[PDB]
């Protein structure tokens, strides 16, 4: 799940296989017959829910947008009195209403989760 | 493990109580004592020391001569036999049919556990004039007659039906109809052409009587 | 006046402060969601409840402030036109504009209008109107009101068509149902749908809402109001009530009649309790006994002090004759007789409740002629209230 | 912001496009018919002009 | 609920165990397919202690569910019960290892002894399987309602009682659940009532629904009209919808 | 999104309710413009073509869309947006050309087709003389407009050379905003909202009790103002 394995030779991807002979896990391109050591204890992973720490893309020049409201919360890092905040950008009916404050200076993200 | 056995025992006891109540309501002779049989007594009698539910609960009900025989001089004896097999087979139902025929029982009630075989259902309507009725334990766990939304159903004899038709001047088709597969019809064992009487309570009159024909 | 507007403004400000506190609590994830609802649905429900309560309180204050000489108040009190909500919206505050039951949705990206800021959940930005019609509306609440009116117009336009289609189908599906001369409801094919119209055979236009005293009340009150005993202490009949006082004591026929009447009354009470689980006593019934007895009392000039000329035996026999004289089916066989007997059970219960011996000799005191007139009027009204065969 | 309004612009453009295509088809059919004998321009043009005027009206 | 345990809050809390708790979907957070050629040992040390204390017998592929602390809340924690239900729904060689329900996070591991087939068994264990409750039921809401019951003195009084509202409709087996009152159960869907109660009960439920619809706004309609409508629509053994396929498919006159 | 484009009250009753809409006052519809000059301007100012573009090694790139067609990416959307706005306000680009930038989505869409509905709006720019944002239109421009309006009745000798609405558009005081571009701007209802940050707040003041209450302000980054 960390990264889909791609063959160094050619450009295809490496499905996974078992080296029981050496009782090991080896990823195989099975097109050009390229096999490496393939050292990883994870094969597949599925995530049922979505976390809250994803915030947003937080692209630079976020302060250039005038539609984002401004607040006066103190930044934990630089102790500034100016910042912008927005709700979580995950679009579902179960997401909470926690605000993600973004510091225009020092490029810091701090949430309002006082739980 | 033990909780599943206890739940199955309780469900079997409730089904047995419902079967006894249905037999009593159909017009046969069942004392009120055996109807409210305690769970402890049921476990002591119909269950062995190991704890597995033994389906030895076979009873033969006879029609009382006080009212049942007088109203319907054609009712004989009833044979209700529970089955130990989880899913019944064609051969087992053949032995059941032979057992019913040997002592010429007028009607017999068979209760399965999970599902019924279509092959056995094909031969279900055989061996006339004896009628074979099939029931499910899950459907018989609770009694639907005791529900507050289900009014009282009273069967009508041939003379009563003829008198009603003559008095109201109606044909057989000019009556409300109830399906033969209706749960109340199965509970009462209604046959084709049988007229049932329904007594309900209304907000305009104290009592109201309605008649339906099993068609 | 000034103080009333100040109080309304204070109430609105308090509601806005409460909404702001709720929003602040929710934004910190300290809010607890009601079971079966998400963290947003409960918050929205709380917000709309607070806003509606504030609007109702402001409207009630404005209505209270209005004097008795107010023309709108006079129109509302008379009931000719207007209501409390109209006065509230015209004088104190216009209610929050809503779409399909919810607040104004975010038409833009997390915004309702371009003039607001992103992720704004304040009541003003979500479609809550603070001003009244007299004061005037800002452009935002004007737009919200326009959206609400558009929704209303669309709802009316769709509803009229759907209701027309439903009405046409219902009329076409029940156009052949008639009541025949045998008091049975049948279709064109002759199939019987109802063995008696309305399960009682009574015309709808000849039914009035009446209360049954037997079902209601406590056991002690019921016994005090109904039980009458002669050869015993307590619940005794006052001799001055009737001219035959101080002489009916020691009689056996009167005592057995009284106790059998009490047994019938208690059986009727049990039957009514079984029929009506909720205990409701006000039910529509054909003939209004109370109006008849009041008319008889007014037209006969009862002295309410002189002893009555009625007798217990005469009253009981008259009640039984009246009960037997109510015919709805008029049949001779057993089935029709049983149907007629059990199709007037509720009316018999009401008649027994309203014509008890204690009630007649204590509250509604009538003479022999007045009692006969009451019985004849009851019988005539019941006979005239029966449904007419041939009705659609 | 994702919807467009059609004034008396592209509607007349579509009408004129269809009618001009009919014009071209008619003139091409006449040219194909006349390759055997001779050529001239103002016989199919007039009839197809009546067609385009009638269609627009 | 039962008349005896009407105001019993503990009985009400025990009730609502009939809600369908989906398998490893509303309780778990993540799923792992950690590969381990060693049937006994494991690469990570998180569960080495539980493996040590716990101890065709080799499972090269291993499952792992992260679960969540919400298992203790709402429904019972029952760390062993979930794995026991998985075992009794799988059996065969689906050897699983339980957690100790005290080492902070709750981890349940599944192993199969004989990767494409692994996905199929994971899908079966995740999509179509139930632990406890009644199927076709999603949300159950508990609320308190006031019911009028006569007092021992003979007077009607308002007695509060607990009432459960269920989003789903599975009355066929809901009525058989112990601890509830089967003679007072009601469903706004009259379609399912007749198949379990009868035609008359279905007619009564249909009349109740019609009355509720009519009286919602506040208007009053005489009982005779609604009674006639419900009797006409249920003259036969089942519902006769007022449509083309309903009343218009009878033995009446062709012209009509 | 119908604010300022269609009448919220004018609609027929019946089956056509909501389907027939009447254009509001001060509402216009674009006629169309070829996008080739826009493409040339984008290429001249620095804009990598889509052909020689790799998603990796260029994570922070804003896609550029012209009439719904992807043409390439830009490494600094803010500078290009400012240049395009300056060109449009100077009259070099057609005033009816929509230009909307999505900072979060990393997209820059430019529309030059026909059928779009737009309305004029005031332009608010920060002024260092007053220390706060103020309307670009001034009393001098207002006086010139009134002089033009009065002159045409008489035989005026081109006192201000017919200072008309086109002059306002070309000077940069009023610009056209469509529905799509309305999602990236902040609009003040009235010029009274463009007061200093304090705006006489946190101080007790007396106002007319019968006057309609208004919240107003609650912002300091206004980019446009409603004409009326
Ligand atoms: Zn390769
Ligand atoms: Zn900072």
Q: What was the elucidation method?
A: cryo-EM
Structure tokens at B87: 């899913």
Say whether the C–A interface has 3 or more Cβ pairs within 8 Å: yes
Q: Which residues contact C238 (CB under 8 A, 6 or more apart)?
A: C245
State how far the Cα of B162 lies from the Cα of B53, in Å rounded to an integer. Answer: 47
Work out whether the CA dihedral C173, C178, C183, C184 comes out positive or negative: negative
Taking a C-beta distance cutoff of 8 angstroms, is the pair B178, B155 a contact? no
SS3 C126: helix
| DSSP state for residue B185 in the 8-state scheme | H
Q: What is the homologous superfamily of the domain B2-142 according to CATH?
A: RNA polymerase, Rpb5, N-terminal domain (3.40.1340.10)
| DSSP state for residue C43 in the 8-state scheme | H
To which residue do tokens 């919360």 refer?
A73
State how far the Cα of F177 lies from the Cα of F175, in Å rounded to an integer. Answer: 7
Give the distance from residue C153's alpha carbon to the nearest chain A alpha carbon, in angstroms. 30
Four-point Cα dihedral C2, C4, C9, C12, nearest 10: -170
Taking a C-beta distance cutoff of 8 angstroms, is the pair E38, A24 a contact? no
State how far the Cα of D38 lies from the Cα of E72, in Å rounded to an integer. Answer: 98
Q: Is domain A47-115 given the CATH code 3.40.30.10 in the classification?
A: no
Q: Which chains touch D (3 or more CB pairs under 8 A)?
A: F
How buried is A27 (Cβ within 10 angstroms: 0-12 exposed, 13-18 middle, 19+ buried)? buried
To which residue do tokens 């409701």 refer?
C280
Task: From B144, B141, B61, select the one nearest B108 (Cα to Cα).
Answer: B61
Q: Which residues contact C203 (CB under 8 A, 6 or more apart)?
A: C385, C386, C387, C388
Resolution (A): 2.8
Domain C1-138: state its class: mainly alpha
State how far the Cα of E168 lies from the Cα of E182, in Å rounded to an integer. Answer: 17
Please report, in range form, the residues annotated as the binding site of A.
7, 10, 29, 32, 75, 78, 103, 106
State how far the Cα of B184 lies from the Cα of E197, in Å rounded to an integer. Answer: 7
Taking a C-beta distance cutoff of 8 angstroms, is the pair C235, C227 a contact? yes
Number of H helices, E strands in chain C: 14, 5
Taking a C-beta distance cutoff of 8 angstroms, is the pair C73, C67 a contact? yes
Rg (CA), chain F: 21
Residue B112, φ and ψ in degrees, nearest 5: -95, -170
How buried is E126 (Cβ within 10 angstroms: 0-12 exposed, 13-18 middle, 19+ buried)? middle
The strand pairing partners of E150, in sequence order, are: E156
SS3 F186: coil
Number of H helices, E strands in chain B: 9, 8
Helix or strand (DSSP H, E) at F36: helix F36-44
Taking a C-beta distance cutoff of 8 angstroms, is the pair C297, C262 a contact? no
Task: From C332, C328, C326, C317, select the one nearest C372 (Cα to Cα).
Answer: C317
State how far the Cα of F136 lies from the Cα of F224, in Å rounded to an integer. Answer: 10
State how far the Cα of A85 lies from the Cα of A97, in Å rounded to an integer. Answer: 12
- Whether the upstream peptide bond of residue C323 has omega within 30° of 0, thus cis, is no
Structure tokens at E245: 């396929």
Cross-chain CB nearest to C150 (options F15, F18, F211): F18
Number of Cβ within a 10 Å radius of residue B115: 10
Half-sphere exposure of E172 (CA within 13 A, CB side): 12
Taking a C-beta distance cutoff of 8 angstroms, is the pair E102, E53 a contact? no
To which residue do tokens 């989003």 refer?
E167
State how far the Cα of E191 lies from the Cα of B155, in Å rounded to an integer. Answer: 26
State how far the Cα of F224 lies from the Cα of F228, in Å rounded to an integer. Answer: 12
| DSSP state for residue F8 in the 8-state scheme | S
State how far the Cα of A16 lies from the Cα of A21, in Å rounded to an integer. Answer: 15
Give the distance from residue B154's alpha carbon to the nearest chain E alpha carbon, in angstroms. 13
| DSSP state for residue C197 in the 8-state scheme | G
**Pairing of the two strands C208-211 and C282-285:** antiparallel
Interior angle at CA C222, CA C217 and CA C223, nearest 5: 155
Residue B129, φ and ψ in degrees, nearest 5: -90, 5
Cross-chain CB nearest to E237 (options B11, B150, B182): B182
The string of DSSP codes covering A4-64 is --B-SSSS-B-EEEE-GGG--EEEE-SSS--B-----S-S-EEE-S--STT-----S-GGG
How buried is E22 (Cβ within 10 angstroms: 0-12 exposed, 13-18 middle, 19+ buried)? middle
Task: Categorise residue F128: left if φ over 0, alpha if ψ from -120 to 50, beta otherwise.
Answer: alpha
State how far the Cα of C370 lies from the Cα of C379, in Å rounded to an integer. Answer: 14
Residue E147, φ and ψ in degrees, nearest 5: -120, 135
Taking a C-beta distance cutoff of 8 angstroms, is the pair C82, C72 a contact? yes
Task: Give the max Cα distance, chain E.
Answer: 85
Task: From B73, B74, B66, select the one nearest B29 (Cα to Cα).
Answer: B66
Number of Cβ within a 10 Å radius of residue D31: 12
Structure tokens at F189: 């209802």
Number of Cβ within a 10 Å radius of residue B176: 22
Alpha-carbon distance values, C4 to B167, C9, C65, C71, F52 (Å):
75, 9, 7, 18, 72
State how far the Cα of E220 lies from the Cα of B16, in Å rounded to an integer. Answer: 46
What residues in F contact D9, CB-CB < 8 Å? 31, 114
Judge whether B2-142 and B143-215 match in fold.
no
Taking a C-beta distance cutoff of 8 angstroms, is the pair A67, A112 a contact? no
Work out whether the CA dihedral E88, E92, E96, E98 comes out positive or negative: positive
The string of DSSP codes covering C29-92 is T---PPTTS-HHHHHHHHHHHHHHHHHHHHHHHHHHHS-TT-HHHHHHHHTSS--HHHHHHHHT
State how far the Cα of E245 lies from the Cα of D44, in Å rounded to an integer. Answer: 60
What residues in C contact F188, CB-CB < 8 Å? 115
Structure tokens at B42: 């049921």
Taking a C-beta distance cutoff of 8 angstroms, is the pair F224, F185 a contact? yes
Helix or strand (DSSP H, E) at E12: helix E9-14
State how far the Cα of B131 lies from the Cα of B106, in Å rounded to an integer. Answer: 7
C:118-137 residues touching chain F, CB 8 A cutoff: 124, 130-131, 135-137
Domain ranges within chain B, ordered by starting residue: 2-142, 143-215
- Whether the upstream peptide bond of residue B129 has omega within 30° of 0, thus cis, is yes
**Pairing of the two strands B208-214 and B177-178:** parallel
Say whether the F–E interface has 3 or more Cβ pairs within 8 Å: no
State how far the Cα of F44 lies from the Cα of F80, in Å rounded to an integer. Answer: 11
Cross-chain CB nearest to F221 (options A59, A66, A89): A66
Cross-chain CB nearest to C346 (options B163, B176, B206): B206
Q: By the CB < 8 Å criterion, does B151 face chain E?
A: yes
Q: In chain F, which ranges are E strands?
A: 28-29, 48-49, 62-66, 69-74, 98-102, 107-111, 117-127, 132-135, 174-178, 187-188, 224-225
The strand pairing partners of B208, in sequence order, are: B200
Please measure the distance between the N-terminal and C-terminal CA atoms of chain C and give it in whole angstroms.
59
Structure tokens at C40: 């947003």
State how far the Cα of C315 lies from the Cα of C322, in Å rounded to an integer. Answer: 11
Say whether the D–E interface has 3 or more Cβ pairs within 8 Å: no
Task: From C289, C294, C293, C298, select the one nearest C210 (Cα to Cα).
Answer: C289
Half-sphere exposure of C206 (CA within 13 A, CB side): 16
User: In the CATH hierarchy, which fold is given to the domain comprising B143-215?
Assistant: Eukaryotic RPB6 RNA polymerase subunit (3.90.940)
Tell me, in angstroms, the distance from the centre of ligand 1 to residue C137's CA: 70
Looking at the structure, give the CATH architecture of the domain made up of residues E22-133.
Answer: 2-Layer Sandwich (3.30)
To which residue do tokens 């009041």 refer?
C294
| Environment of ion ligand 1 (residues, CB < 5 A) | A 7, 9-10, 12, 29, 32, 34
To which residue do tokens 């008349």 refer?
E3
Task: Count how many pairs of residues, chain C against chain F, have C-beta atoms within 8 Å.
Answer: 61
Domain with CATH 2.20.25.10 in chain A: 2-46, 47-115
Q: By the CB < 8 Å criterion, does C281 face chain B?
A: no
State how far the Cα of E198 lies from the Cα of E188, in Å rounded to an integer. Answer: 15
Number of Cβ within a 10 Å radius of residue D13: 11
State how far the Cα of C364 lies from the Cα of C233, in Å rounded to an integer. Answer: 24
Residue C112, φ and ψ in degrees, nearest 5: -95, -40
Q: How far is CA A73 from the centre of its chain?
A: 26
Helix or strand (DSSP H, E) at C368: helix C368-384
The string of DSSP codes covering B9-72 is HHHHHHHHHHHHHHHHHHT----HHHHT--HHHHHHHHB-SS-PBP---EEEEE--TTTHHHH-
Taking a C-beta distance cutoff of 8 angstroms, is the pair A54, A90 a contact? yes
Q: Which residues contact F1 (CB under 8 A, 6 or more apart)?
A: C107, C108, D1, F179, F182
Taking a C-beta distance cutoff of 8 angstroms, is the pair E231, E203 a contact? yes
Tell me, in angstroms, the distance from the centre of ligand 1 to residue A35's CA: 9
Please report, in range form, the residues annotated as the binding site of A for Zn(2+).
7, 10, 29, 32, 75, 78, 103, 106
Taking a C-beta distance cutoff of 8 angstroms, is the pair A80, A70 a contact? no
Q: How far is CA C154 from the centre of its chain?
A: 32
**Pairing of the two strands F62-66 and F107-111:** parallel
State how far the Cα of F105 lies from the Cα of C33, in Å rounded to an integer. Answer: 32
Task: From B116, B80, B102, B103, select the one nearest B189 (Cα to Cα).
Answer: B80
How buried is B185 (Cβ within 10 angstroms: 0-12 exposed, 13-18 middle, 19+ buried)? buried
E:22-51 residues touching chain A, CB 8 A cutoff: 25, 28-38, 43-44
Taking a C-beta distance cutoff of 8 angstroms, is the pair F49, F72 a contact? yes
Task: Give the max Cα distance, chain D.
Answer: 59
User: In the CATH hierarchy, which fold is given to the domain comprising A2-46?
Assistant: N-terminal domain of TfIIb (2.20.25)
Residue E204, φ and ψ in degrees, nearest 5: -65, -45
State how far the Cα of A3 lies from the Cα of C23, in Å rounded to an integer. Answer: 41
Give the distance from residue C198's alpha carbon to the nearest chain A alpha carbon, in angstroms. 50
């Amino acid at each position: 799940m960390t990264t889909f394995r791609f063959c160094r030779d050619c450009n295809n991807m490496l499905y996974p296989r078992e080296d029981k002979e050496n009782n090991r896990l080896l990823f195989e391109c099975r097109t050009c017959s390229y096999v490496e050591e393939a050292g990883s204890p994870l094969v597949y992973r599925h995530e049922l829910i979505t976390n809250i720490g994803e915030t947003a893309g937080v692209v630079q020049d976020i302060g250039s947008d005038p539609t984002l409201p401004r607040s006066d919360r103190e930044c934990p890092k630089c102790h500034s009195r100016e910042n912008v905040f927005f709700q979580s950008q995950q679009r579902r009916k179960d997401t909470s209403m926690v605000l993600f404050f973004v510091c225009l200076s020092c490029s810091h993200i701090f949430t309002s989760d006082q739980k | 493990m033990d909780q599943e056995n206890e739940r199955n025992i309780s469900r079997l006891w409730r089904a047995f109580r419902t079967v006894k109540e249905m037999v009593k309501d159909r017009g046969y002779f069942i004392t009120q004592e055996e109807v409210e049989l305690p769970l402890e007594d049921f476990k002591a009698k119909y269950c062995d020391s190991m704890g597995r539910p033994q389906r030895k609960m076979m009873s033969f009900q006879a029609n009382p001569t006080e009212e049942s025989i007088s109203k319907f001089p054609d009712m004989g004896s009833l044979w209700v036999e529970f089955c130990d097999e989880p899913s019944v087979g064609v051969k087992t139902m053949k032995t059941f049919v032979i057992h019913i025929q040997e002592k010429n029982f007028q009607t017999g009630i068979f209760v399965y556990q999970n599902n019924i075989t279509p092959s056995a259902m094909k031969l279900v309507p055989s061996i006339p004039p004896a009628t074979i009725e099939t029931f499910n334990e899950a459907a018989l766990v609770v009694n639907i007659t005791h529900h507050e939304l289900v009014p009282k159903h009273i069967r009508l004899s041939s003379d009563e039906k003829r008198e009603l038709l003559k008095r109201y001047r109606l044909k057989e088709s000019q009556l409300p109809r109830i399906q033969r597969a209706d749960p109340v019809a199965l509970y009462l064992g209604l046959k084709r052409g049988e007229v049932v009487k329904i007594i309900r309570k209304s907000e305009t009159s104290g009592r109201y009587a309605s008649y339906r024909i099993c068609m | 006046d000034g103080p009333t507007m100040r109080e309304i403004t204070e109430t609105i400000a308090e509601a806005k402060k409460k909404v702001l506190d709720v929003t602040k609590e929710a934004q910190a994830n300290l809010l607890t969601a009601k079971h079966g609802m998400t963290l947003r649905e409960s918050f929205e429900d709380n917000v709309v409840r607070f806003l509606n309560e504030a609007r109702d309180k402001a409207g009630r204050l404005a209505e209270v402030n209005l004097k008795d000489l107010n023309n709108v108040k006079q129109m509302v009190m008379a009931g000719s036109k207007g209501s409390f909500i109209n006065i509230a919206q015209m004088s104190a505050c216009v209610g929050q504009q809503s779409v399909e039951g919810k607040r104004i949705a975010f038409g833009f990206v997390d915004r309702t209008l371009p003039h607001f800021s992103k992720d704004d959940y304040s009541p003003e930005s979500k479609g809550f109107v603070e001003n009244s019609y007299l004061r005037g509306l800002t452009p935002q609440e004007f737009f919200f009101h326009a959206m609400g009116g558009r929704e209303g117009l669309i709802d009316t336009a769709v509803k009229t068509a759907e209701t027309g289609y439903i009405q046409r189908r219902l009329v076409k599906a029940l156009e052949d149902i008639m009541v025949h001369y045998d008091n049975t409801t049948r279709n064109s094919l002759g199939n019987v749908i109802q063995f008696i119209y309305g399960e009682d055979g009574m015309d709808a236009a000849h039914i009035e809402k009446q209360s049954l005293d037997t079902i209601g009340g406590s056991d002690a009150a019921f016994e005090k109001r109904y039980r009458v005993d002669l050869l015993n202490t307590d619940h005794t009949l006052d001799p001055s009530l009737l001219e035959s006082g101080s002489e009916i004591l020691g009689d056996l026929k009167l005592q057995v009649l009284l106790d059998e009447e009490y047994k019938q009354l208690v059986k009727d009470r049990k039957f009514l309790r079984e029929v009506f689980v909720d205990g409701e006593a006000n039910w529509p019934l054909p003939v209004n006994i109370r109006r008849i007895i009041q008319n008889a009392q007014q037209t006969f000039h009862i002295d309410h002090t002189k002893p009555s000329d009625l007798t217990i035996k005469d009253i009981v026999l008259g009640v039984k004759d009246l009960q037997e004289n109510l015919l709805v089916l008029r049949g001779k066989n057993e089935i029709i007789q049983n149907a007629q007997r059990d199709a007037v059970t509720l009316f018999c219960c009401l008649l027994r409740s309203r014509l008890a011996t204690r009630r007649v000799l204590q509250e509604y005191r009538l003479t022999k002629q007045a009692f006969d007139w009451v019985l004849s009027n009851i019988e005539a009204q019941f006979l005239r209230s029966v449904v007419h065969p041939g009705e659609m | 912001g994702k919807k467009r309004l059609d004034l008396a612009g592209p509607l007349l453009a579509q009408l004129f496009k269809t009618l001009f295509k009919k014009l071209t088809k008619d003139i091409f059919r006449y040219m194909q018919r006349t390759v055997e004998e001779a050529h001239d321009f103002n016989m199919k043009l007039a009839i197809n002009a009546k067609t385009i005027t009638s269609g627009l009206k | 609920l039962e008349p005896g345990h009407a105001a019993d809050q503990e009985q009400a809390k025990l009730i609502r165990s009939a809600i369908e708790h989906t398998t490893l979907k509303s309780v778990t957070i993540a799923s792992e397919i950690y590969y381990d050629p060693d049937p006994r040992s494991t690469v990570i040390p998180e569960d080495e202690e539980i493996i040590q204390l716990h101890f065709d017998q080799q499972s090269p592929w291993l499952l792992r569910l992260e679960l969540d602390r919400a298992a203790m809340n709402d429904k019972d924690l029952t760390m062993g019960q979930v794995g026991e239900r998985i075992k009794q729904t799988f059996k065969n060689d689906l050897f699983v290892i339980w957690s100790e329900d005290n080492d902070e996070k709750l981890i349940i591991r599944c192993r199969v002894v004989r990767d494409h087939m692994l996905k199929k068994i994971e899908n079966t264990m995740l999509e179509n399987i139930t632990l406890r409750g009644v199927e076709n039921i999603e949300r159950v809401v508990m609320m308190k309602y006031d019911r009028k019951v006569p007092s021992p003195t003979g007077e009607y009084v308002k007695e509060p009682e607990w009432v459960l509202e269920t989003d789903g409709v599975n009355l066929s087996e809901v009525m058989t659940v112990p601890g509830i009152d089967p003679t007072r159960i009601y469903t706004n869907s009259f379609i399912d009532i007749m198949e379990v109660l009868g035609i008359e009960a279905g007619r009564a439920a249909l009349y109740k629904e019609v009355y509720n619809v009519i009286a919602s706004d506040g208007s009053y309609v005489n009982y005779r009209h609604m009674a006639l409508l419900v009797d006409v629509m249920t003259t036969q053994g089942g519902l006769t919808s007022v449509t083309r396929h309903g009343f218009n498919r009878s033995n009446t006159g062709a012209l009509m | 999104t119908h604010w300022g484009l269609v009448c919220p009250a004018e609609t027929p009753e019946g089956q056509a309710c909501g389907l027939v809409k009447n254009l509001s006052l001060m509402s216009c519809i674009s006629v169309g413009t070829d996008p080739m000059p826009i493409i040339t301007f984008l290429s001249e100012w620095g804009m990598e073509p889509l052909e020689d573009y790799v998603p990796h090694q260029s994570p922070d790139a804003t896609r550029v869309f012209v009439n719904g067609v992807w043409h390439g990416v830009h490494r600094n959307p803010a500078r290009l947006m400012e240049t395009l706005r300056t060109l449009r306000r100077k009259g070099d680009i057609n005033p009816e050309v929509s230009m909307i930038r999505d900072i979060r989505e990393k997209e820059l869409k430019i529309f030059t087709d026909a059928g779009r509905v737009y309305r004029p709006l005031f332009i608010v720019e920060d002024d260092e003389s007053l220390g706060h944002k103020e309307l670009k239109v001034r009393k001098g421009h207002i006086a010139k407009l009134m002089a033009t309006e009065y002159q045409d009745i008489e035989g005026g000798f081109e006192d201000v050379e017919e200072y008309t609405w086109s002059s306002l558009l070309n000077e940069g005081l009023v610009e056209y905003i469509d529905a799509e571009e309305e999602e990236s701007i902040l609009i003040a209802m009235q010029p009274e909202d463009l007061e200093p940050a304090e705006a006489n707040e946190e101080n007790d003041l007396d106002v007319d009790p019968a006057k309609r209450i208004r919240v107003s302000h609650h912002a300091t980054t206004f980019t446009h103002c409603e004409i009326h």
